[PDB]
């Protein structure tokens, strides 16, 4: 007997005999670790390109609603405040004195509070190098 690390083959099994194998053996390839990479995240992995076209829809059709109720009691100045509120409101503002729109914007304003939840929490983990 020749006990040890002997690999069953075709030529060897002709002139000698082998017992029942008890361990697998094959051929494998080893390469050192590679540095990971992160592709530039398309809008930081949000809610599909649909939402980006989606936000343009209601925002542009809700500013006109305010303009309609503005005269009854400046659309160019009515797009600066309405939009910029959604992104960490810090820019200079110009707010109308219309009572009907005053209540309306607050409901719109509350949307920005909930919007951040979509762009927070989730974005933390999915930013590091991936794809292996």
């Amino acid at each position: 007997m020749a006990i040890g690390s002997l690999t069953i083959n075709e030529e060897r099994s002709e002139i000698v005999d082998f017992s029942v194998p008890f361990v697998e053996t094959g051929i494998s390839v080893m390469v050192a670790r590679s540095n990971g990479t992160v592709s530039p995240s398309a809008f930081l992995e949000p809610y599909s390109p649909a939402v980006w076209v989606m936000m343009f829809v209601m925002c542009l059709t809700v500013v006109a609603v305010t303009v309609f109720i503005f005269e009854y009691l400046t659309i160019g100045k009515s797009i600066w405040l309405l939009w910029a509120l959604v992104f960490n409101n810090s820019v200079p503002v110009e707010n109308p004195r219309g009572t009907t729109s005053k209540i309306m914007v607050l409901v719109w304003a509350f949307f920005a509070v909930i919007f951040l939840a979509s762009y927070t929490a989730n974005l933390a983990a999915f930013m590091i190098q991936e794809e292996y």
């Binding site: 949000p46 009854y72 009572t99 009907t100 309306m104 719109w108 979509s118």
Partner: protein
């Protein structure tokens, strides 16, 4: 994980509902 268009439907009618409800109050406000 992708938020996608779905799984966020509830907040949608809140913007729309305010528009629908808001036009009802202004008529009372104008008459007030």
């Amino acid at each position: 994980a992708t938020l996608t268009f779905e799984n966020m439907a509830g907040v949608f009618m809140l913007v729309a509902g305010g528009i629908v409800a808001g036009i009802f109050l202004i008529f009372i406000e104008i008459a007030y």
